[PDB]
Structures are given as C-alpha cells and as structure tokens.
Amino acid sequence: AIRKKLVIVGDGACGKTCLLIVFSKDQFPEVYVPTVFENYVADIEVDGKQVELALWDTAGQEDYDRLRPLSYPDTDVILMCFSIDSPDSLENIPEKWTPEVKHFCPNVPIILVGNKKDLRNDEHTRRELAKMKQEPVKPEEGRDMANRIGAFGYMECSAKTKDGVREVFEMATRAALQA
Amino acid sequence: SMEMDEKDFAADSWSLAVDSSFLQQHKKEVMKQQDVIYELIQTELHHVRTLKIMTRLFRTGMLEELHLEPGVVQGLFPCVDELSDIHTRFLSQLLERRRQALCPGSTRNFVIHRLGDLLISQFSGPSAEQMCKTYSEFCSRHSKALKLYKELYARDKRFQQFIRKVTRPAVLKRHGVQECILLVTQRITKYPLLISRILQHSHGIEEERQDLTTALGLVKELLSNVDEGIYQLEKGARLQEIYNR
Ligand SMILES: c1n[nH]c(-c2nccs2)n1
C-alpha cells in the first residue's frame, strides 16, 4: 500500500468539506454535519492496486495567500471543485485556482469536479438563480472548462445522495498513481 | 488524550453525548448551538493530542534514541513547546466551562451559554500576541521542517527505523511527522468557520451574539497578522535571494 496525497481546492461554497466527510465516512451524516474536516487516510483499491490516500481540505484558507500554499507540498492529485448550483464558482476556476495550483503543484494531475449535481433539477435552485440572470451549470459547460484548464478529467457528484462520490476518489487514486 | 476527556468527547455530536432524556428538554436552536460548541472543543482536544504526539512521541523519542546533529530536532519541530502551551491552556479553559455547566449528578449533561467571553479573552491581549508570534514563526519554518524530515528519512537508516517503528500502530495512521505539521498549520484557519456557525445559533441572548461577533473579528485580525508575517525560510538560500524578494 503506497501512500499518496490528495488536496481539494475551490471556493468556500463549492461543497469541498462535505465531499471529504461523505467519502471518509461512506455516509451523509444523519445527526450532525461537521463544520470542519481535519484529515483522513483512506484505504483504496483501484484496478488491483492498494493505496493509502491522505485527504486534505483547504476550507478556511481562501483569504490567506501565505498560509494557503502550505497545504500543497508533495501533493499527488488535486480535486478542483465548483458547485453546479453556482456558475460564479465555475468562473473562478481559470481566474484564481488554476494558475495557483499549476504554480505550487507543477505536473500534478487536476480533476475538475462538479459538486451538488442533485441541485441541477431542483426547482428552488432554478428560481433563485434566475433572479441574477443565471442557471445551474450544464454538464457540457463543466467538460469545456476542464478541457480549457488542461484537467486530467471531468467528473460530477452529489455528497447528499453519495452518487459519483466513490468514483471521484477512485479516479483521483488512478491519477495519483500515473507517471 | 486522557481517558476522562476522550470518553466525554467520544460521541459524534453533543446531541448523542448527553442523555436522551436531557436532550428532550431543549429547544431545537439550543441543540444546534451546542452541537457546534461541542465540535469546537472536540477538535481542540484532538489538536492538543496532535501536539502531544509531536513533543512526546516524535521529539522526545529522537532525543532519547537517536544521535542527530545539534539543531536537527528543533528544525524538525519548530515552536512545538510554545504551541503546546498555548493550546493546552485554551483547552483547559474550554473543559472548565463545560465542567462548571454539568448538572449535579451527571458527568455528561451540560449546556454552555457563555462561550463568547472565553473566545474574546483567548483572541485578545497577551495570549493573541503570543499566538501571533508563535504561528508567524512556525508557519515560516514549515517548508524547512518538511525538507529536513525528507533528507533524514532517505539518508539515515536509524531515523527511518525509528519513524517506521513509532508510526506503525493503527492509532498513528493520520499522524506521521509531515501530517502533524500540516494539521497544526491548518488549525488556526478552522476557528472562523466554527465561530461563525456557533454565532448563527446564538441570537437568543443579544449579549452572546455581540460577544461572538467581537470574537470572530479578533480571530480574523489574528489570521491576517499571521498571514502578513510569513516568509518561508530556506536552508542555504543566500542573502542576495532574500533582499531581492
Ligand atoms: C503564481 N501564481 N499564483 C501564485 C500565488 N502566490 C501566492 C498565492 S497564489 N504565484
């Protein structure tokens, strides 16, 4: 079991903390949803290979440009998150996060992840966004952004229902194992 | 951590830690406030435990078993005793507030109504100056500590055996040397998230809402000061590289 390091980046409202919690517990919390995530080492077997994947969150570091890069040393795979209920979080992907992650993590694979995919067909979400002349991010808009930033791949998930969550972390492990 | 505190913070939430007959006596908004205060204290207990692994397991084990060159153990674990002193004091104050709030005849049923004042005290005056000085120093030495660790693990046989030996137990899975250093660096940026969510459920008493609003502002001032005082030290970097930054 080789050790690999994963870091999740993205805006404060992208759902990165929730995603790490749901994966690490293999359950959406039924009693209390934690505010923060410390770290975790997941045992994962992907395509016949056993890996210990250390998980780290960047939540709370978004406003601190000198503290935030301390999370990046020796990272093996980056999960770059945006929320499907927020086209504004997707616009900040090529603007701020991509040049930062390419600077501190050169040649590290980046997986662009569309979170909260359950909200794409949510009526309250569609009504709220229409007031600011917006709509939920379409899957093709996510793919095009991923292609544009040179991401290893594009994936979507919902921490609420767990759909796609296992797949995201298994693919992150595969990317971490590549040359 | 000591068994008494581990057991008091074993449950996933305050609502599962207290007796179900005690939980039924409170309003929904009080349960939400108490679950977030419990997460703050539980994560502080874990953070103090991380600092004890660094001082007692790693640092002390290297001094008593290995023959490292002078200044190597300090370089691997910068400011660990000052950090341990800051957070053990803060944890003691948090656990004393919980202890005083316990119902007579119970070691688990409590409600903390006055957290704001404790947070204002921790994040102002001499203790905020010490946190700012200690984290500005620690975070500026983060890169140097990681590089020093990597060199020793790859070139010193006895150091590699030591690390593999003390990190072998399952309870150390998340707590290798580099993992402890990043857990500590990330701790300070967790405080605003926890405080803001406690504030969200503390509108019932206006003085408490005001105190948590002041505490949140003080924590953000501390973080801004620490962030502005960081510059990664690099062993071997020449003066020309520094004054041309
Ligand atoms: C080059 N691209 N992004 C950067 C950053 N420096 C500090 C925080 S982000 N450098």
- For residue A31, what is the nearest residue in chain B, using CA coordinates? B13
Closest of B199, B142, B167 to residue A3, by C-alpha: B167
Q: A61 CB under 6 A from ligand 1?
A: no
Q: What's the per-residue H, E or C state across chain A?
A: CEEEEEEEECCCCCCHHHHHHHHHHCCCCCCCCCCCCCCEEEEEEECCEEEEEEEEECCCCCCCCCCHHHHCCCCCEEEEEEECCCHHHHHHHHHHHHHHHHHHCCCCCEEEEEECHHHCCCHHHHHHHHCCCCCCCCHHHHHHHHHHCCCCEEEECCCCCCCCHHHHHHHHHHHHHCC
Q: Answer whether A131 touches B (CB < 8 Å).
A: no
Does A49 show up as a binding residue in the annotation? Answer: no
> What does the angle CA A84 – CA B196 – CA A38 come to, to the nearest 5 degrees?
70
Tokens of B234: 């690099």
Tokens of A63: 């406003």
Contacting A residues, span 46-85, partner chain B, CB-CB under 8 Å: 54, 56-57, 59-61, 63-67, 70-71, 73-74
Q: A3 CB under 6 A from ligand 1?
A: no
Which chain B residues touch A70 with a CB distance below 8 Å?
Answer: 139, 142-143, 182, 185
Within 8 A by CB and 6+ apart from A47, the residues are A174
Among protein residues, the one whose CA lies closest to atom 7 of ligand 1:
A65
Contacting B residues, span 115-174, partner chain A, CB-CB under 8 Å: 139, 142-143, 146, 173-174
Tokens of B139: 């975070």
Interface contact A36-B12, CB threshold 8 A = no
Query: Which residue among A100, A101, A102, A105 has the greatest number of ligand 1 atoms within 8 angstroms of its CB, and so is best to mutate?
Result: A100
B76, B145 contact by CB (below 8 A): yes
- B58 by Cβ neighbours in 10 Å (0-12 / 13-18 / 19+) ranks as buried
Within 8 A by CB and 6+ apart from B211, the residues are B114, B115, B116, B117, B119, B120
CA B199 – CA B188 distance, rounded (Å): 18
- B68 by Cβ neighbours in 10 Å (0-12 / 13-18 / 19+) ranks as middle
CA A36 – CA A33 distance, rounded (Å): 9
CA B50 – CA B134 distance, rounded (Å): 17
CA B58 – CA B1 distance, rounded (Å): 16
**Pairing, β A110-115 against β A40-46:** unpaired
Closest of A52, A110, A46, A35 to residue B198, by C-alpha: A35
Instruction: Please give the domain boundaries of chain A with CATH numbers for all domains.
Output: 3-177 (3.40.50.300)
Q: Answer whether B185 touches A (CB < 8 Å).
A: yes
**B157-166 helix and B142-155 helix, angle to the nearest 10 degrees:** 110
